[PDB]
């Protein structure tokens, strides 16, 4: 739901107080993407 | 460099696009006094 | 309670009060009195 997926564009087209909300969306989403991958790899590891 | 400007109840609007608004070479050509900018400073118009 | 308290006091044009907020843009907040983008405190203003 951020203005872009390109973090360099959020950092170019906004600044500090307005930017850091639009970046914290990408922190939340990316982190969810990693934690989903690691949870699937733990479950495959238990199968292998 | 127009021959005359418009009657202000029926002012003249032109759309400026697909071009470089190089400020110094045209604003040095005709003498003028006021450069009252709002929201952006005069010097930063060179690379914004 | 407060561990230290520091009253800053100065005069501006009522047009400038919106720039005394953290991280904004405009000549007072750019060249005269710039507070932290993360400051803790209160901004107070009135006409005189």
Q: Residue C22: its chain A contacts at CB < 8 A?
A: 16-17
Exposed/middle/buried for residue B17 (C-beta within 10 Å: 0-12, 13-18, 19+): exposed
Contact of C26 with chain A, judged by CB distance below 8 Å, is answered with no
CA distance A8 to A11: 5
Resolution in angstroms comes to 3.1
CA C10 from centroid of its chain's CA atoms: 9
Cβ(B38)–Cβ(C18) below 8 Å: no
Helix (H) or strand (E) holding A36: helix A16-47
Q: What is the distance in angstroms between the Cα of A4 and the nearest Cα belonging to chain C? A: 22
Chain breaks in chain B (C to N over 2.5 A) after: none
- State the structure-solving technique: cryo-EM
Name the nearest CA neighbour of C33 among C48, C14, C19.
Answer: C19
List the structure tokens of A48: 């292998």
Q: How far apart are CA A40 and CA A21, in angstroms?
A: 29
The single residue listed with the structure tokens 């005709």 is B30
Please indicate whether, in this complex, the C-beta atoms of C22 and A15 are within 8 angstroms of each other.
Answer: no
Positive or negative torsion for Cα C4, C10, C14, C18: negative
Strand, helix or coil at A16? Answer: helix
Nearest to C19 by CA among A3, B41, B34, B44: B41
Q: Is the dihedral angle over the CA atoms A31, A33, A34, A39 positive or is it negative?
A: positive
Minimal CA separation from A16 to chain C, in Å: 7
Burial class (CB in 10 A: 0-12, 13-18, 19+), A34: exposed
- Distances in whole angstroms, Cα of residue A21 to Cα of each of A11, A24, A29, A37, C9: 11, 5, 13, 25, 31
CB-based contacts of A2: which residues, under 8 Å, 6+ apart?
A10, A22, A23, A25, A26
Longest dimension (CA), chain C: 34
Q: Cβ of A10: how many Cβ atoms within 10 Å?
A: 21
Distance CA B13, CA B18 (A): 17
Distance of CA A13 to the CA centre of its chain: 19
């Amino acid at each position: 739901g951020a203005i872009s997926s390109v973090l360099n564009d959020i950092l170019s087209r906004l600044d500090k107080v307005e930017a850091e909300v639009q970046i914290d969306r990408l922190i939340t989403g990316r982190l969810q993407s990693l934690q989903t991958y690691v949870t699937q790899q733990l479950i495959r590891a238990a199968e292998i | 460099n127009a021959t005359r400007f418009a009657s202000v109840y029926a002012w003249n609007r032109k759309r400026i696009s697909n071009c470089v608004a190089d400020y110094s070479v045209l604003y040095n050509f005709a003498p003028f006094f006021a450069f009252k900018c709002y929201g952006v400073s005069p010097t930063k118009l060179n690379d914004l | 309670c407060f561990t230290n308290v520091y009253a800053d006091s100065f005069v501006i044009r009522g047009n400038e009060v919106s720039q005394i907020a953290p991280g904004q843009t405009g000549n007072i907040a750019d060249y005269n009195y710039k507070l932290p983008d993360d400051f803790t405190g209160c901004v107070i203003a009135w006409n005189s």
